[PDB]
Symmetry: D2
Subunit: 311 residues, 4 copies
């Protein structure tokens, strides 16, 4: 009759571990930590299982390197793929050199999902998001609504945090949308932010924040990734990306119909088609139940056309 | 050097019972179910205490009719209950003045914007420590009706219903937002009509009376109790939540010496700030007409 | 293309509440705030709509996403994963059939949790009316009775009740057997605390006697009506164990077919609740003096 | 009048990272990530982004200056024998100076030895210096719960003694919602020969994950444990937790930390619960105290 939700984390790196950790303490469902190094997933799995006993939670975490174990998964969250190039210096390679290898990686994962988890809600994190997700949509052959990219929730939440940290208010009430591509071409709609429905321009007229501080926030939102790549020294952000993915996986598993900015396959929205792109959407039991097409200005539309053409 | 949060509920009625229940399962702190009918508070305490053992929660709730038991309370929510009710507020606030001289006083009794003023004068506390519960109930009601129509998680539907907690409230429907997106966009896409948005404004005004006639006896209590606990949590935990509630004004909106529902930041200092919304002449007249009713 | 239909692969859990009384209202409240699933408040009377609309207002306050409705029509129970029943011996028994006949028609795959008293008698009337397997028709009582026993101990020991575990078995009534001498505190037998001086055997014996009359103790305290906050928490705690397949160890009224020497009678006993409802019945090793109190409980049932 | 809790973590490593994450998402209080290195600011900022997603209110900051520990309600230690013993004193001397009312929760290994160094450095009372017990005991209950296939929420157990190979997994005293584990042995769900091995696996669990991880050791469960302990102190839960406590006569020993059940509340160690042991179990405890 009923059964536990099954989430497969294709990639048990830094992001994968925190994702399993959160989902288990929230009892969102059983977790499969799939990694090409199986003991890495088995280590976090067993470790998180010891945490469940500490936290009195009932669900199970598994580690594996075999695609048979992600079978019947309701959600597949993908972080696998190349992130670094050890045998070359920082000067001999750019990010464009990993796109093609990662593209083939996205296919192998897609075929196995199509094989073992034909009904899975595929959330992708591997970057470049807007391109990598499109590789999964082809490989999985799933409908438009069951293949989503994670971003915009991370990008918008970062924008809303910087706003909240300045106003000294609970970020629960700072809403905002950062759209476009999940990269340096994103569009932080910082002047459309709202504080519990209150337009941000009000707080400008009050002196709580300044137009200059907003423009600088939009710029720090664009480089938040690299900012943390330089703070960590070795690696990138993972705590917040993990929380974003699990928040999207819960909106699906629980049919919350939450409004999240996600990378979505377009077929006419904003004047584009056949491309993934960050945009607010309604995530529910059918995945992307609805795309909210924002009313952009000519300047904001130009910025959107620019990131689409670099995707 | 650490201590449990203490929440006194002056009034163990239907609202009081749900408040103690939510606070005990959330482990928000100890609860004192104060009521002139001492047994009623004792019943729900022992019943909620049975819930704690089921739900594996550690805090304790008690029932009493002695103000000596609300001593050192961090929060005092009042549901006990115009002229005679006003007098009841002075007796409560005068005891809070003595036993709970540091409590964040939240008022539920109606008329809200008047009773809370009688608690402010009796307790002698500064204005930033005596707040009233309205607007958070009134705004969430509005946000629901819009979420239900849009079929969206109300988590992302924000809105402000200002004014007095009565028929003169001002549901700012046309300023509602969905994940920051203006509500007008959803009108321009067919998801909802301005006519339906105007209908939600009136339903919000009359939501209180709608449930009175649905219940047949009594009124709402699940949502009021839930809002009072959220306000009490933003204080105890210093969350600094933007919550619309009845605040004492000394100039804001052009009014003084009157309690009025406006968005504000609730933190460790109770009301740390008041957010004076930028109102149109259409909204000011509605506000000025609500102050006159108060 | 047929693997790419606009058909949802997941659903919200659906919990129907037959009886929107004081317990029904708290059950809908707790379930909604925990985002456990949609709730259907069913009652013969507006009473279910009032609590639903008021609890939906609470959802907007608490940023919770699930839905609650009121109704007086079994049609809104269809496809419910869980049916919890509080409406309500002879007249109650007949009421339990009508409910059971509709739960069979509309919610043929529901996990039926009974609360109406006499628990052990009403839940059996349900089992016969729905015709479901015995493992999907359970009665709530031992989790309430046991937790009450554990609170009285935790209250005297000044310990978190999260670590106080104990079993109260038998029938949901004066015949219940609260095994106070077997209570454990984070695995530690309570006898140790007796040796430490934190509690006396006399107090333990008296806690057993207070657990039995806890129902009436709150009736006199309430003056009008019985307890409801805890019976609601217990019920939702069990529905959550089913909807989430927690394999939770819960004392509850189960249909026995050999255990404890009895058969064809509902009797409270520790069990394991999961996606199959009652997945295992744990039979406790009873003493001679305890098997006697158990045999008396079945006689009264 | 009131105030956020101040939970400072001396050590922004893997364990320290999961701590801030769990504390922030649970809104248990403000978090401070201290470390010799940027390591704290990275996780503080990364976790601050997570707050905005999870709609949580509290704040986290990284730092490398003990001045940011001032007035900390809790100080959880993971930085790091003789060398790491000097660090405990350096750490303790700062907790003494900036957070003199802090509830100290040590994790650095050897637990029972490193925590005493903190006790003598901070100079705090007996009850305000604990050592994270809850990990070892919970590991035992997981393996039993995994075999029995029951919610570990209802499996209680106590793994007493030192936090090393000399620990005592009391696998035979385990209870399932108060039901003795022997009933499940007579039930067919498990065998005594399997419980004896669960004790061994519990002893070597810390080393099992070091080999699985390959690089470094466990951190998810160790982090969850100390946050539970810190939550039992800040919320005055008076919860029963197995943890390292400074003894003064208990079990026939004194002037030594040792893993034992205890009550944790607003006063830290509210009470030590001395378990009723046998001759075989006391000899193991005596063999552990000597190794500490």
């Amino acid at each position: 009759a009923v059964r536990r939700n099954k989430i497969s984390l294709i990639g048990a790196g830094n992001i994968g571990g925190v994702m399993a950790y959160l989902a288990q303490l929230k009892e969102l469902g059983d977790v499969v930590l799939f990694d090409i190094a199986p003991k890495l997933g088995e280590a976090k799995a067993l470790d998180i299982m010891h945490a469940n006993a500490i936290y009195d939670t009932a669900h199970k975490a598994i580690g594996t390197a075999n695609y048979e174990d992600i079978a019947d998964s309701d959600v597949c969250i993908i972080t696998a793929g190349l992130a670094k190039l050890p045998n070359k210096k920082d000067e001999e390679w750019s990010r464009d050199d990993l796109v093609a290898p990662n593209s083939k990686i996205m296919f192998t994962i897609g075929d196995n999902i199509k094989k073992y988890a034909p009904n899975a809600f595929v959330i992708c994190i591997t970057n470049p998001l807007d391109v990598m997700v499109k590789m999964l949509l082809k490989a999985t052959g799933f409908p438009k609504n069951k293949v989503v990219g994670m971003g915009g929730l991370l990008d918008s939440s970062r924008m809303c945090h910087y706003i909240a940290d300045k106003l000294n208010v609970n970020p629960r009430y700072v809403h905002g949308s950062c759209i476009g591509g999940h990269g340096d071409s994103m569009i932080p709609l910082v002047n459309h932010v709202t504080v519990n429905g209150i337009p941000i321009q009000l707080f400008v007229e009050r002196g709580d924040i300044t137009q200059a501080e907003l423009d600088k926030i939009a710029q720090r939102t664009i480089g938040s990734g690299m900012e943390l790549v330089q703070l960590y020294g070795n690696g990138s952000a993972y705590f917040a990306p993990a929380t974003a993915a699990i928040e999207m996986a819960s909106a699906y598993l629980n049919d919350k119909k939450s409004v999240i900015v996600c990378s979505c396959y377009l077929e006419g929205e904003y004047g584009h088609s056949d491309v993934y792109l960050g945009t607010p959407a309604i995530i529910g039991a059918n995945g992307i139940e609805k795309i909210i097409t924002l009313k952009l200005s000519s300047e904001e539309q130009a910025k959107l056309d620019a990131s689409v053409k670099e995707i």
